[PDB]
């Protein structure tokens, strides 16, 4: 089960 | 940025002259991500190549296994052909049945 | 000794093009779901056969993610850009690990969050879960805005909770595959002394007489290796696979 990333770079 | 291709040109299983086999060009360690495999019979293209999808290592370098049929003969040689931007002039790698 | 990793690449494009995002998971060190933008229709697909009784819902819900994460990359590497003074007209390559390790009891080990730009390591998150390392004065930018904004924490609750409970459910489905051993077979070849192991699966072998090549892929999913000599006074073969260790010499 793959992730949402939070803030970007 | 820019990470030169490591190549292994070799058959899926021991070669026998004559025997239908897989010849395989392994290509590694490279980095950007865009290349150009080609492989050769007796210095010409081989058109139906096939390509595994794009992956990386745990090390970010990208890597790809590119095959095709072949049959082994006392007098055809093979080879493959890597084109990348590290690389001044393409990489021709012949198949050696010892390695 | 488990593990589940995501690989994700999102590689620019000059042109009026957007980037082409990819998404990769392991299970074992083997690839069991792929996700591409390039496809006809992107949509996460099963790669190892155990994730067919996965219904639509979970392809639907993964698929969502992937097209989150197209979405963050597209804007992350317009920052990248920006901190390194880079040019649109050239491509760019972002890359992503994340996962956990596990061991044979099943609990975790470690959580990984790991990030490249052009290739080169740029920030982590430490096995502390908690801090971040960054790699070059650029990183330090990105370091400074999620310390500030606790971006680790929304990673830590992944790593730990559903990288963990999702794992337990593949390695469970996954069972017979994941437990699958394909033997070595070998042999001895003269010029140098050269010992082949062949058609072994999984990857990890010992081959013992030096010269010893970089493990390569037979093509059908298994792997092989070969070691060779200066020179019957001379190898050992060391695989899971095997009922015991193999033991041979040149043979004529």
Redesign the interface.
Known sequence: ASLWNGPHL | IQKTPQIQVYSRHPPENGKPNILNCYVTQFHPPHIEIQMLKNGKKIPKVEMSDMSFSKDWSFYILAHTEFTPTETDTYACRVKHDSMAEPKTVYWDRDM | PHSMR??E?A?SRPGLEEPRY????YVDNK?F??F?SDAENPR?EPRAPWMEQEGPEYWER?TQ??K??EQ?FR??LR??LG?YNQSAGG?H??????GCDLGSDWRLLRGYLQ??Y??????ALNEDLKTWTAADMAAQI?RR??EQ?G?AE??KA?LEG??V??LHRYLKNGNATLLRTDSPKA?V?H?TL?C?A?GFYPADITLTWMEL??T?????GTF?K?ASVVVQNYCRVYHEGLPEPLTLRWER
């Not at chain 3, 990819?22 to 998971?25: A, C, F, L, P, R």
């Not at chain 3, 390559?93 to 994340?98: D, G, P, V, W």
């Not at chain 3, 390569?216 to 059908?220: K, L, T, V």
Request: overall charge negative.
């Open positions: 995501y690989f690449t590689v990819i998404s990769v998971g690839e779901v792929r591409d996460y993964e993610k992937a989150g994460q963050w804007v992350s920052n990248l901190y491509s390559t972002l890359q992503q690990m994340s990030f490249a052009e290739g080169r390591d740029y920030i990105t805005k999620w904004s971006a929304h990673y992944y559903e990288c409970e999702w042999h070849t010029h050269r082949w062949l090549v970089e390569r892929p037979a093509g059908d092989q070969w």
